[PDB]
Amino acid sequence: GRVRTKTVKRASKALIERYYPKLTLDFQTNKRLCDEIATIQSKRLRNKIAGYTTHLMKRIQKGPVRG
Amino acid sequence: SLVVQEQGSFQHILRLLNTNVDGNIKIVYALTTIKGVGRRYSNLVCKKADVDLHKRAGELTQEELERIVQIMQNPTHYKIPAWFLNRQNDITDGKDYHTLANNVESKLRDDLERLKKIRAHRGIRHFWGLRVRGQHTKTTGRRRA
Amino acid sequence: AVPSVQTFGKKKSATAVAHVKAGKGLIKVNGSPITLVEPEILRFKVYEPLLLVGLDKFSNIDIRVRVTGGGHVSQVYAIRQAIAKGLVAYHQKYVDEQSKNELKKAFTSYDRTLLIADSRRPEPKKFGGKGARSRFQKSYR
Amino acid sequence: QQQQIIKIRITLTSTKVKQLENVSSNIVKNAEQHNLVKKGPVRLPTKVLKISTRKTPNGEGSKTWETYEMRIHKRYIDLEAPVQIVKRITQITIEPGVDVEVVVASN
Amino acid sequence: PGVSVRDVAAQDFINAYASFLQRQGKLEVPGYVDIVKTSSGNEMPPQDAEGWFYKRAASVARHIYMRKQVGVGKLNKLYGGAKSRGVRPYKHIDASGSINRKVLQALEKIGIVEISPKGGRRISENGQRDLDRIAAQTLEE
Amino acid sequence: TPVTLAKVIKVLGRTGSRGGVTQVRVEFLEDTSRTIVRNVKGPVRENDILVLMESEREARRLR
Amino acid sequence: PGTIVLYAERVQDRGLSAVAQAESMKFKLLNGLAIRRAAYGVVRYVMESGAKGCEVVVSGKLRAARAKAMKFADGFLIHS
Amino acid sequence: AQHAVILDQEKYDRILKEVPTYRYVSVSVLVDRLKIGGSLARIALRHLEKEGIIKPISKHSKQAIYTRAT
Amino acid sequence: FTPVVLATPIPEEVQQAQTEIKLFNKWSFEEVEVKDASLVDYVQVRQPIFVAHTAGRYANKRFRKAQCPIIERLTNSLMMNGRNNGKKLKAVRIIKHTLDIINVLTDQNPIQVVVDAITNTGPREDTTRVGGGGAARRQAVDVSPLRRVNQAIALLTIGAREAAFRNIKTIAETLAEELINAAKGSSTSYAIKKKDELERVAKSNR
RNA sequence: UUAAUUGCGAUAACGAACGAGACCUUAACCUACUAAAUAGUGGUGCUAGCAUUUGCUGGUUAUCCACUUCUUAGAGGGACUAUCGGUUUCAAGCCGAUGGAAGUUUGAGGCAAUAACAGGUCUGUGAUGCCCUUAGACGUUCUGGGCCGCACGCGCGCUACACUGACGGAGCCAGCGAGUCUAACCUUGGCCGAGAGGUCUUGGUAAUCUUGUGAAACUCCGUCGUGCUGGGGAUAGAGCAUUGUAAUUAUUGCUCUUCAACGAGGAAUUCCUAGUAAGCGCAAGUCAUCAGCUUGCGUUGAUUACGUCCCUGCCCUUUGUACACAC
RNA sequence: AAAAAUGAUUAA
Ligand SMILES: [Mg+2]
Ligand SMILES: [Mg+2]
Ligand SMILES: [Mg+2]
Ligand SMILES: [Mg+2]
Ligand SMILES: [Mg+2]
Ligand SMILES: [Mg+2]
Ligand SMILES: [Mg+2]
Structure with missing residues (x-):
């Protein structure tokens, strides 16, 4: 399965809180921005965080999201 | 690819060295029925007997069968290197022999009797019927040994 | 210099490096002609890139293939993959690429492994069994 | 001796990747700093030393095996330099756990 | 028109060269032929009692021609094979060293191979010549 | 032998103790309104044709 | 003689050394202080x-x- | 069962008589229809192809496939 | 037509294969047209293969093996009973020989003979074990097309293997005669009679 | 809903921790970087060997230039279920297709919580309490023997019952390793010998040499011909060698001879879902000698199913209990 | 709605 754990979920939510204007709908630049708007010890976790951040962004675009 | 046509001159079951050597089988694998001669010994005897290797043991003629028997009796006098033989450097006289059909069992009896009469371990193991080459007897060779 | 490209094809552990330059239609494997590739039951596996695209455009080109590693079948598959990748590589470098696109479509419509190495890899053995999955016979009582 | 080249060769072996790479980088840096033309650090395939043992000290339980590994990383650099500088480089650029060998190549 | 022994099939080329060597009389059989079984792994002597040595000589000459130099030990490993060991599993056993040595010496006396200052036996001048001739006639048979 | 052919339009579920049987909802090709539920042995996708010796039973082991 | 040389230097932040803590507890146990206390x-x-x-x-x-x-x-x- | 490994005159005229009209000619069919051993079948098959009254389709060891000529 | 000169001499008999894909360069997949409906999209004779040996991944999905060519599926089914595990080269050579023999005995496409045998040997009704009591019973169920082709291939290869065991006749020849008999339906072929027994038992447990 | 106490969420709980995940190793992708007689390719530039209006090869960085596609290893990039189409308390997610080297957590492992078991080890330990013994010793050495002993029962296995084969010739391909100067380790090559092996030398403290470990299955061409047969090679006899002070109770290897059961195995029962099962060999461990064992490695490579709780069990919830040594 | 009996003493 591909359920994303609380670390990815919370890190993505914090990124949405802090840098919503800077962030963009696509994974490539979201991943690049994560390199400096956050410090992640592993490229795998950074990619997961950016993927969930862009998923949340694509959901926020078509209506708001709770929490 | 020679399709040779033969008359009623095929030799069926025949006698070499007091044994029944049947036709319809190549001479090399037909001589193997004689005790003391196997596939290697028969093939060497045949090629030294200068006989073709596709003769089915039946279109062998009398003089070449006799030559095969003589070579079997006397391997050394037809350039057989004496490491190819059944009995090299025997206890009795130290000359390289080769035991044939009726004499393999006789000589086996004689050497087992020699071991028994000298009361050696392998001989008494043969007398008891156990294994003589150091095999474990705990689990194998149960039903008949 | 002579216009040339060098490519490779990879099966499980066999690798075949192919030199593809301008020539007269010379296809060799290990210095021997492609017609003598063994086993001959699978010799057509090597023939396939020839017989699909067509020998017409192999006239100007020649390919020299050196293959090591693996087994006989794996080497055969390495050779065919290396030949196809060399052909697409030379057409990319020194020829217009619409022809490269017909080559790509012809190879991929037949078999995916003409251009792409099979991604299957050996699974290491684990203790308590003769193989990666199989275990030793268990006994009770 | 009279300011002539010796055809020297240096070999680096260690179990520590970072320390060994630091040593190699330092030697390279002193190389082109003193303007040396050279064959760069050639990296030999990593040697993995394996011992497989039964985990249990006795012979009871599920037969579980366990493999320990050492990793041996080796590099060599072929240099050509006078005595006054081969000694200068050799007496510096050394770290613990990194064994250095210096040989005079005559081939 | 130009060709070496790489553009002909191995098996029929070896048959052609063995038949050639047989017809000609320069190559010498050792004499312990008709007795030996050419490998400890084997259990029966060669079924071609009159031509097996010539076949081995042709095979050795072709193998030497393919390579830089090859020695008796490598020939033994090449021609050796799995040995049935009764109720025990098979294992690789080397071929007859004396046979490989005698066939190499016979090829030397006929002149096909020579000293090879790397340490083995390599292909010689007239050996390369007539081996290429045999390849040529095998193609234009 | 009046063997009939049916086309599966809906897969219902998996039945049998070991789960080795599948329940399918199949219409007929001649009449596309003669739907019956059948029990099938092997793997089944959608839009597959079955050949039935008998063409009147209703498969059991529902729900 | 002279190719082996042996220095001794002080352990900083010795409370972060498991070996030192285990040895100190061991000697406390040998002296007889209570196990829970030590x-x-x-x-x-x-x-x-x-x-x-x-x-x-x-x-x-x-x-x-x-x-x-x-x-x-x-x-x-x-x-x- | 037994098969004759020697070819006598009668078995040769019979094989030359009825091998033609065989849809499939091979070692197995020769042994099954005529009481000839496998080796005798192989050499007889080679003689028949040599004289050209049966034509081969595939020449492979352990599997020889032949049919009627012309 | 119109052979092209090449630096490497490539024979004419394989020049002719450049026209269309031919299995073993002798038989074509054109004009096959599996006739028994309910088996199309499952007996793959659409994409033509030059030889029954490819290293294709047909086991990582559920129904993916339906796209594997049916000749290769039969060839894979030849490698069985331990001593023949692997040895796909031997299996392919056996298939080539048995197709040669099939075309010898019938002036007819061997691929058509194979697909006809598979269609005639696919079991349409089987039974499944049910009932928890001491005497378990059999409940009649229908068979999917994929299982039909799988069981047909298995029955054909098993019958060929058993008829080949301990007799002079070659595995290629007995596979040929088994496929010939199953392509028509004669109740003398192993797969046909086994399917008949399965269907009769399904009738009994109807 | 997830493989997951993984999350969506609900909510007398709130906010945390361990475990899971994350992490680390390894396996795949990189014509991107950095370069390499301890890896290779080309130019054959250099002579060149063999056939010929150009091919295959030899010696190729102290004969020489280049250049890293393949090989190696550092720094890195790459996948995050991306996009699309469906479905969902439309949330977590899930299913298809398209791209991609890679879409079951991409594969496989390493690590791995709380509580416990009178689970195993006092025969690994100069870890150890207590008890016993300590000079005719239960201490320690030396000789010899046993541990292997066979009416029998059982568990891991090996080799087979053959023609999808045995034998013979020829073809001819891996990957993981290991290796001596504090002493004889891996051994090339030449010579001798049927063989096993012997001898004279060489190289290698090793990407350099053994070694391209030219492994085996396999492939092609022939002998066999459904006969316990040329399948099988147990048992046994004779001789020749190697390791070792020492080979008898046969260390092992080799040659000839003997040529038994076994024709597919009752009840019953094991393992396994893709480079996997199975076949096949190889290296390492133990080792003076001894693999039918193990740990890994590669070669060839299926069938079947993507499910269920019927059997055997595991997890959570509810419920009953006269159980707590816990059915 | 097939059949399914038993498990010595002490030992927290
Ligand atoms: Mg070999
Ligand atoms: Mg003692
Ligand atoms: Mg013991
Ligand atoms: Mg290698
Ligand atoms: Mg021992
Ligand atoms: Mg060993
Ligand atoms: Mg052991």
Whole structure:
């Protein structure tokens, strides 16, 4: 399965809180921005965080999201 | 690819060295029925007997069968290197022999009797019927040994 | 210099490096002609890139293939993959690429492994069994 | 001796990747700093030393095996330099756990 | 028109060269032929009692021609094979060293191979010549 | 032998103790309104044709 | 002689050395101080030294023939 | 069962008589229809192809496939 | 037509294969047209293969093996009973020989003979074990097309293997005669009679 | 809903921790970087060997230039279920297709919580309490023997019952390793010998040499011909060698001879879902000698199913209990 | 709605 754990979920939510204007709908630049708007010890976790951040962004675009 | 046509001159079951050597089988694998001669010994005897290797043991003629028997009796006098033989450097006289059909069992009896009469371990193991080459007897060779 | 490209094809552990330059239609494997590739039951596996695209455009080109590693079948598959990748590589470098696109479509419509190495890899053995999955016979009582 | 080249060769072996790479980088840096033309650090395939043992000290339980590994990383650099500088480089650029060998190549 | 022994099939080329060597009389059989079984792994002597040595000589000459130099030990490993060991599993056993040595010496006396200052036996001048001739006639048979 | 052919339009579920049987909802090709539920042995996708010796039973082991 | 040379230098932040803590507790046990006291004193010293977590396990026979294992912990402790 | 490994005159005229009209000619069919051993079948098959009254389709060891000529 | 000169001499008999894909360069997949409906999209004779040996991944999905060519599926089914595990080269050579023999005995496309045998040997009704009591019973169920082709291939290869065991006749020849008999339906072929027994038992447990 | 106490969420709980995940190793992708007689390719530039209006090869960085596609290893990039189409308390997610080297957590492992078991080890330990013993010793050495002993029962296995084969010739391909100067380790090559092996030398403290470990299955061409047969090679006899002070109770290897059961195995029962099962060999461990064992490695490579709780069990919830040594 | 009996003493 591909359920994303609380670390990815919370890190993505914090990124949405802090840098919503800077962030963009696509994974490539979201991943690049994560390199400096956050410090992640592993490229795998950074990619997961950016993927969930862009998923949340694509959901926020078509209506708001709770929490 | 020679399709040779033969008359009623095929030799069926025949006698070499007091044994029944049947036709319809190549001479090399037909001589193997004689005790003391196997596939290697028969093939060497045949090629030294200068006989073709596709003769089915039946279109062998009398003089070449006799030559095969003589070579079997006397391997050394037809350039057989004496490491190819059944009995090299025997206890009795130290000359390289080769035991044939009726004499393999006789000589086996004689050497087992020699071991028994000298009361050696392998001989008494043969007398008891156990294994003589150091095999474990705990689990194998149960039903008949 | 002579216009040339060098490519490779990879099966499980066999690798075949192919030199593809301008020539007269010379296809060799290990210095021997492609017609003598063994086993001959699978010799057509090597023939396939020839017989699909067509020998017409192999006239100007020649390919020299050196293959090591693996087994006989794996080497055969390495050779065919290396030949196809060399052909697409030379057409990319020194020829217009619409022809490269017909080559790509012809190879991929037949078999995916003409251009792409099979991604299957050996699974290491684990203790308590003769193989990666199989275990030793268990006994009770 | 009279300011002539010796055809020297240096070999680096260690179990520590970072320390060994630091040593190699330092030697390279002193190389082109003193303007040396050279064959760069050639990296030999990593040697993995394996011992497989039964985990249990006795012979009871599920037969579980366990493999320990050492990793041996080796590099060599072929240099050509006078005595006054081969000694200068050799007496510096050394770290613990990194064994250095210096040989005079005559081939 | 130009060709070496790489553009002909191995098996029929070896048959052609063995038949050639047989017809000609320069190559010498050792004499312990008709007795030996050419490998400890084997259990029966060669079924071609009159031509097996010539076949081995042709095979050795072709193998030497393919390579830089090859020695008796490598020939033994090449021609050796799995040995049935009764109720025990098979294992690789080397071929007859004396046979490989005698066939190499016979090829030397006929002149096909020579000293090879790397340490083995390599292909010689007239050996390369007539081996290429045999390849040529095998193609234009 | 009046063997009939049916086309599966809906897969219902998996039945049998070991789960080795599948329940399918199949219409007929001649009449596309003669739907019956059948029990099938092997793997089944959608839009597959079955050949039935008998063409009147209703498969059991529902729900 | 002279190719072996042997220096001794002081351990900084000695409360973060598990070997030193285990030795000190061992000698406290040999001197006879209470096992719970010695374990908790070791844990407090380690935590005061700035460790993220400490863990002391004392296994064996304690006051009874039957052996048991006492466990003392403070802070956080990862395992995998 | 037994098969004759020697070819006598009668078995040769019979094989030359009825091998033609065989849809499939091979070692197995020769042994099954005529009481000839496998080796005798192989050499007889080679003689028949040599004289050209049966034509081969595939020449492979352990599997010889032949049919009627012309 | 119109052979092209090449630096490497490539024979004419394989020049002719450049026209269209031919299995073993002798038989074509054109004009096959599996006739028994309910088996199309499952007996793959659409994409033509030059030889029955490819290293294709047909086991990582559920129904993916339906796209594997049916000749290769039969060839894979030849490698069985331990001593023949692997040895796909031997299996392919056996298939080539048995197709040669099939075309010898019938002036007819061997691929058509194979697909006809598979269609005639696919079991349409089987039974499944049910009932928890001491005497378990059999409940009649229908068979999917994929299982039909799988069981047909298995029955054909098993019958060929058993008829080949301990007799002079070659595995290629007995596979040929088994496929010939199953392509028509004669109740003398192993797969046909086994399917008949399965269907009769399904009738009994109807 | 997830493989997951993984999350969506609900909510007398709030906010945390361990475990899971994350992490680390390894396996795949990189014509991107950095370069390499301890890896290779080309130019054959250099002579060149063999056939010929150009091919295959030899010696190729102290004969020489280049250049890293393949090989190696550092720094890195790459996948995050991306996009699309469906479905969902439309949330967590899930299912298809398209791209991609890679879409079951991409594969496989390493690590791995709390509590416990009178689970195993006092025969690994100069870890150890207590008890016993300590000079005719239960201490320690030396000789010899046993541990292997066979009416029998059982568990891991090996080799087979053959023609999808045995035998013979020829073809001819891996990957993981290991290796001596504090002493004889891996051994090339030449010579001798049927063989096993012997001898004279060489190289290698090793990407350099053994070694391209030219492994085996396999492939092609022939002998066999459904006969316990040329399948099988147990048992046994004779001789020749190697390791070792020492080979008898046969260390092992080799040659000839003997040529038994076994024709597919009752009840019953094991393992396994893709480079996997199975076949096949190889290296390492133990080792003076001894693999039918193990740990890994590669070669060839299926069938079947993507499910269920019927059997055997595991997890959570509810419920009953006269159980707590816990059915 | 097939059949399914038993498990010595002490030992927290
Ligand atoms: Mg070999
Ligand atoms: Mg003693
Ligand atoms: Mg014991
Ligand atoms: Mg290698
Ligand atoms: Mg021993
Ligand atoms: Mg060993
Ligand atoms: Mg052991």
